[PDB]
Symmetry: D2
Subunit: 320 residues, 4 copies
């Protein structure tokens, strides 16, 4: 199949390359022509066309149904591209938003684009060589049509042990290949958002445990209550056969082996948006979510010094 790709950052460029390596043709565009030419040089021979604008890209899509994948900075930039494509595309064409879009915008865009018969698909991704775990929303018609593109990008079943009771109606076998049609437009970015919220919580659980172990050698403790524990070795031993074995643990063991004191790191952690939006979904649904909440607030506080709340505490105490 042929697909246009707008946005050639790390993920957009890699997506184009992996598609071209799996027998699909790509039409490439990015605001920066040097990035366009770099990705063109990375794409398998003759599997690619470079466009110079969005209209030129659309004109270069010659299949019955034009498919355009947008991988742009979330927000106004992605919205601008979507509206321009809304003007340039027509009935049964397909727009895929692979960005970290707030899922409610996906619901809105899909409704607008449907007034012209344009199908909207939101893809949340979690690479070039290993494939992309994908959670996506849209109509059955459009997601069926683009199934070959997604199958090309997905990791496939791999060598992990299969989940035992999966042979039943209601369970989509494509989930075992690492890509899942989650429901209508917006549901893919919604599931990806919660995936990131869970990830935040897992990260904070590990981070707290390692802090507790590191601080078991604290001067504030009496010497006979101290242990001088080896952080990198503990992360490593947990990699094999423990209940906490996980991709996150693997990363932590690599970072601790490099520099166990973590002296090279500030500890100032951003939150990309998905954490906040996960908490908002919890609020909307009256779901208690203390772990994702604690993870988000730890991130907020890591970026400031002492904040006004803490100054209020000191002021109250002094007033005693």
């Amino acid at each position: 199949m042929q697909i246009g790709i707008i946005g050639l950052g790390r993920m957009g460029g890699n997506i184009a390359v992996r598609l071209s390596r799996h027998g699909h043709d790509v039409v490439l565009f990015d605001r920066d022509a040097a990035t366009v030419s770099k990705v063109s040089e990375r794409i398998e021979g003759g599997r690619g066309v470079a466009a110079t604008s969005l209209p030129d890209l659309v004109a270069k899509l010659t299949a019955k149904r034009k498919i355009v994948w947008v991988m742009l900075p979330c927000g106004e930039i992605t919205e601008n591209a979507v509206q321009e494509l809304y003007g340039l595309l027509g009935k049964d064409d397909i727009v895929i938003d692979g960005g970290n879009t707030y899922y409610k915008d996906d619901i809105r865009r899909a409704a607008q684009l449907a007034d012209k018969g344009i199908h909207y698909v939101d893809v949340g991704t979690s690479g070039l060589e290993r494939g992309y775990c994908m959670m996506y929303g849209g109509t059955k018609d459009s997601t069926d049509h683009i199934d070959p593109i997604l199958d090309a990008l997905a990791p496939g079943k791999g060598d992990v042990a299969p989940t035992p009771d999966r042979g039943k109606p209601g369970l989509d076998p494509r989930a075992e290949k690492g890509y899942l049609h989650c429901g209508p437009a917006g549901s893919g970015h919604f599931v990806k958002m919660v995936h990131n919220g869970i990830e935040y919580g897992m990260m904070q659980a590990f981070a707290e445990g390692f802090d507790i172990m590191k601080s078991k050698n604290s001067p504030k403790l009496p010497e006979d209550q101290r242990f001088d524990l080896n952080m990198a070795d503990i992360a490593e031993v947990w990699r094999r056969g423990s209940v906490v074995s996980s991709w996150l643990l693997d990363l932590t063991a690599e970072a601790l082996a490099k520099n166990a004191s973590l002296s090279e790191f500030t500890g100032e952690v951003a939150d990309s948006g998905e954490g906040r939006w996960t908490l908002e979904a919890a609020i909307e649904e009256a779901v208690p979510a203390p772990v994702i909440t604690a993870s988000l607030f730890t991130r907020f506080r890591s970026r400031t010094g002492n904040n006004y709340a803490e100054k209020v505490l000191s002021a109250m105490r002094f007033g005693f």
Copy 2:
């Protein structure tokens, strides 16, 4: 090597069997003689001997250094066995406590046993489910002399390096290569059960992170939501897709996908969750050390509240609300 094992519950019996399958001679004891004979039947090649009492077990250990592994219920029972061994063993013998003992008890026991030259080793194990065939992830404390001596025993029980990708940049002093085989000498006595305790605390937090996310997704179809804000999400398929290539890929996720595939409604579970000592003890360590631990704490409190109806705090909230 020859090793005595007292306590033949699931873990003790499995440990005896795996040791014997790696060619070690094991002397078996349990308060219930029928359990001793059940475990003996599982050992092959004559590498198992049934003892009739704890003194008889000790008498059957003929090596220069007697090694006795205690795998009993936490608390008074383990303590009784350790005190009896204090009386029965002598200089350079080794007592291993493999239960989920509170690590401060290990510090006290090792100091006492050192009075007679008896070495005390605390072993914390993870992975008890798949352990017989797949091996045990182990975190253990004690003196270098004794833990060096029992290295073949621990290596027999550990999973080995396996086929996972090796961690980069480990060829440095300070980093124990045995960690890559799944068993780690953590420091002096008590440090093994301390590290295992924190492992469980982290596990609590990871479990709660998943449980919250799945609750949010499940309730995206809630009647309380406007119809046009709902999604009817497939919990088992979402669990499954995250298994391959995602940031939350993990053994806990594998279990969750299996449970959800079996029955997505989780019909068969009440939701009333117990907590063993380790979550509480991890939070105690955080407090002692002035470490913020909101995720482990939230996991513990969620468990507390899952076991009750509305509690007194909530009734106080209602009374205040009525008051204005």
Copy 3:
């Protein structure tokens, strides 16, 4: 002064009565004419007039600047009234919204109304229980011109300085002396409902702090504790003793002591706690501003969980635990 009031529920009717007791002429309207007549009966000295519709209410306001106070259910109902007034009023008239409106709606309404020169004032009130006799603590937003004009109305409704000790060091520029009387111009439109929203968020946290402490004390007699670690504590007397000279002395404590004196078991309350918009909206503001707010969040989540049985998250926890 003359003022129209639309919405004669508990708060609207009480506000009309107190205004009239301070000599203001009030024009009354409510969708239910029987409520209008009930409130009219409570006004003395001819200072109340019953209107028959919102346009009739507006027609009965003969001052240079028409002032209309809207005290209706949050949401579509208040919005309908505000839009109708946008059509009926003109330059320099004043619309006051006294409900618990989401403050972003106040920002939008004030911008729209300024198209016709109509001034919009948001008033957040606290103390609705004792308000008729004791006055209303008020937080309000709008232009200086309009809020200056309605100052006698707000002063009539406020508690006044009373007999509490004055706050030291308030004789400074930047500090509004009206704050000492219990009504504060908080800034532009929306800022009054914003400050009131945060007031309620703090209240949630204070309530939960007390509720947790009382739960800890009540459960100090728990059967799960060893008998020699129990205390049988008297909740109502502990509440009472804290009223005089303690750090937790507060109106919430006064209410709690009263409720516990009435019935210490709190037998009559389920513990299932609702939450109006303000707790959620306070947390939304914290998120927007990247402010950690763990206590307000914990109070909200406690309320969520008080209303359900075991939820899906807890069933996921049970399923994972069974898995190993």
Copy 4:
């Protein structure tokens, strides 16, 4: 009555003065003789005796039942005094511990002292002019005996509105005077400990709200979503007729009126012990206590920079 007082810090000295002003005789001791002489000069004429040691103090207590109030730094110092008094006192004498003692130590001391017939009373206090709110444990015999001393120190009923349904058996009228016999030894310091835990939670609730209001003018917000709110005026207006009116609010309004930016404060807040012990009691009892927990953890984190947990988070993110 006559009472010996050991420990003449702020509270010990004030307790001695207030007793002497209410018709009781005090015998004073402190390790620092200059502090002894300062308090002696503050005590009403001839209501006082200065002792030079614990034995001299006990010898100067000539009543049938010797009462000794210990107001010393918690821990080894208080324990040393209690053991020395255990040696010096006898049957039906009374030892009062007014410090911030961990209540389990009170249970232990009371049992030891009872082996000689010495009664042990723990008093938790929450001053000179206004009186002390007191929560105390011990036997009915000893607490009855010292009731005049406690009544002298308590605030009395004052001018606040009386709690309506208080005229019933089971409700101790002394609670309305601001001192409460809480049960056996240890129960007073236990109730005081939870009082402090509640106070922490109340403080953190206010502190969070003021932080939210202060940060409503944040640069990170778009200008049209900002309010520049007056912190001192908001605290003040809430003092009269609001649901949050409280002693803590009064203190906050005074601090904000002095310096609304709170520029003079670090925000580095200690935790004295009661917060931790409250949380431990919650754990022991399987009681969820997220608000007191969040308050304690905010204090822990206010005293450090970025901690090892946060560095673990940065390391994981970089590993992506």
